[PDB]
Amino acid sequence: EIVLTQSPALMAASPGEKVTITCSVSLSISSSNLFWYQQKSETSPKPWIYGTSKLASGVPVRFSGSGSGTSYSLTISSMEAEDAATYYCQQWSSHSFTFGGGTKLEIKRADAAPTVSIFPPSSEQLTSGGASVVCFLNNFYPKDINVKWKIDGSERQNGVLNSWTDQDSKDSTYSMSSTLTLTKDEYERHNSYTCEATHKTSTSPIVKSFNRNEC
Amino acid sequence: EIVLTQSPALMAASPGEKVTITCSVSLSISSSNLFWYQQKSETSPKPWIYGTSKLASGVPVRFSGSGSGTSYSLTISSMEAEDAATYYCQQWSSHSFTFGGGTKLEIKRADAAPTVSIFPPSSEQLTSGGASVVCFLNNFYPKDINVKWKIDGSERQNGVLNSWTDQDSKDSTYSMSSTLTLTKDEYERHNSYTCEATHKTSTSPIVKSFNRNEC
Amino acid sequence: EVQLVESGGGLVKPGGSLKLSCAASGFTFSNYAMSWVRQTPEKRLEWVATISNGGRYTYYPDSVKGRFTISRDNAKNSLYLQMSSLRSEDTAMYYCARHLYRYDVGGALDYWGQGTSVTVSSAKTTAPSVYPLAPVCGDTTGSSVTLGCLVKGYFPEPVTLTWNSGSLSSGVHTFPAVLQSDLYTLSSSVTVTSSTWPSQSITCNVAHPASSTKVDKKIEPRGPTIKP
């Protein structure tokens, strides 16, 4: 069947910047059947543009995109801060639907250092024969960050559980959790446990750790 | 215009008793426009019988009422305990609507003595220069009851606030509140305050009172 | 999805106006006729107005003729009713009703609304006063104990009374209020176990939205009136 291809998959912007996406086609297709969709966080998507130029209801006048032939686009003139979502483009076929890949936009703000707080395992997991050292990293910009685990200087990369967050609408920062899960005997063979935060905003990775002081 | 008249205004029954109401007319009227309605407690009414014999949806088969001419009726064969409500009958005219008066039914159960608890006025009303002696009477059957107020033997009937209750669906009893509101100087000129309950289930009215013991 | 709700109402001085509404959803509104039926608080029903589907033919009883105004707009899918120069015997409940058969006027009425209270009087809007209640004493101090809450001196109807934000609802007796000398008086009682009180602290919650009065009072277990 017909297949579509998008560009770019990821692109960021600031309020006051004018952006334009692409939906590339694999064969020449008329204008009267090609549709746009917008999906926010945890929302079932909504129709956006019917028939490649005409807008739908509930759409402000800052939205247009046109053309013909084998290449189409969607241009936001004065981009708001609520336009950080994922788009889709559709084309109808002989008897099949075919959507696109996905087109995500991001909001930029100022740089910051990550805020780091490491937690010890609770007492009830120690009764269960296990241990789990969690090192939270919340409210940082941008998304790209790398962390390490140091057990008495030894860089351990085994038993690491990482998961990032959606871009917040409150401040446009990011958050992350890194988990060092151990066993009961492994947690008592060593003393120091160190999680660090390597980021482009500070050339020295700050150290937030804990000892076995009453532990 | 046409006017309607009902009978009886009040009538009671027990489960296992077969009841029949009346809706009397003032002039001869055909059958095809006369409608019934049922109103529970604090519910906007619902249509009940369309066209003087045919039932509506959501109606069990124990409900019918018929006739012609100048007199109509509604008969419940095996009366439930949820049929204690108020009915209405409608007739359409030249260009006016005309409903009925209202037809209330009650559920009977065994007799009982009233449960009486009298409360003193609170301290904050005493600061406001007033007093209010409330004598509650809850969960009694039937509705008909008479109470008195005795202030050192003197039967006072001035300053009495009475209000009964709807028939409960839990036990088919009734409740009542009687309030003796006084002033601050009047509440200190006497000592004893007595509310009594005169009812057909006990030929001696029981006495629930309070004194000025630490009051 | 057939639904009928209302709006408007409240307090109007004798000599004022009021313009109600009726929201209709689910059927096709441009193929029925619609009519307002009123309910007196003395348990008697009465008819107010009606209007056909197209909006050109109205009908009125003679007892209120020339004073009320009823209209329809098809695209808005809602019903109006406009009043002017009211009287005192309009203190009752209102409803909004759809006729049974299509295109018809004056048959039966199958689906009503729920109600909106309108009272016209010559009183003044006040705020309630809440008083907790506690018994004097008890012989042998049995397990059945009762507490009460008194709401006296407010205007107008209605007021809301709950218990610990609506936690408990069993063994409670809500009483209908009585208007005495332009002040409403409401009383309530609740019967709990003598092991629950005073071990569990309860609070009479009173919500009076007509004067924006939110007074919460708890029960003091019979403090004696002594002073050294």
Next chain:
Amino acid sequence: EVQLVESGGGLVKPGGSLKLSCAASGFTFSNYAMSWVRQTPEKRLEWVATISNGGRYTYYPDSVKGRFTISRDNAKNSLYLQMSSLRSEDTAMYYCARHLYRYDVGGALDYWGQGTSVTVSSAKTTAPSVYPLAPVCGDTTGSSVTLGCLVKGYFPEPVTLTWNSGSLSSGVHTFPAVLQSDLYTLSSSVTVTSSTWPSQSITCNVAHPASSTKVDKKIEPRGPTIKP
């Protein structure tokens, strides 16, 4: 009053069936066509089925032909979809969609539903374990304090985590879970004022409806591990 909700779904072993539904309300259901669109969790959309208004003409992609079953009943005003002999790449999100123009098939899609998750895997249904968190110490004991709650070892998706029955919602960071070795692991954190804690007692509320697990844990403020 245009609404579209769903039902069904859950966990199916590879080798089972599942029969979904779609509830439609508000428009006239006998004058549109209706179609199921699926959403992969790797952020990609895909089409499943469609059916015209009368219910006689169906269309199917070739990748799933002869396996799914779609039908309509006009009086019931709801949509079906019947599955049999599933596979492993059906672990995704489903939707129910109405076409744009009347009487049509295959144009656009204007009003969708909201979603229903279906996962087919070879794991076993377990119950979560909840662990409260508290920091070790702090230099100068500043006013910014953070507490956490760990939910590890449950199956399947989803699970619900609130704080004091959903009292506080500011300064909280809910994290997406990660599946490791047929056990889901979820973590959460909240940052409050050091004057609030331990003066205000908070409790991590975890609701796991797939195994009917309701474990509530509160934070102990760093009890030292000593024993005389």
Next chain:
Amino acid sequence: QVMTLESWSMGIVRPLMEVYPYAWVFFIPFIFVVTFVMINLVVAICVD
């Protein structure tokens, strides 16, 4: 259905003209052609 002039406008053609906006060119000559035949099919009987 379209020959006997029943609901060819509010139920057949005007939903087609939301998708194929030159559909009238097919159905408006057709209403001519057969209806010409129809009245000629009356007049023959009158001659007979």
Next chain:
Amino acid sequence: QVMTLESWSMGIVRPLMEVYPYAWVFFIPFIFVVTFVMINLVVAICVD
């Protein structure tokens, strides 16, 4: 109603074809009977 050609398609026959698939065989020859006799009736008056 089906004789005088009004709403025989979108109101009578086509909601019978959802249940009975072969319903048209009863109603399409009926249109070919009565209508025929009708125009024959018209021809009678013209003859006179």
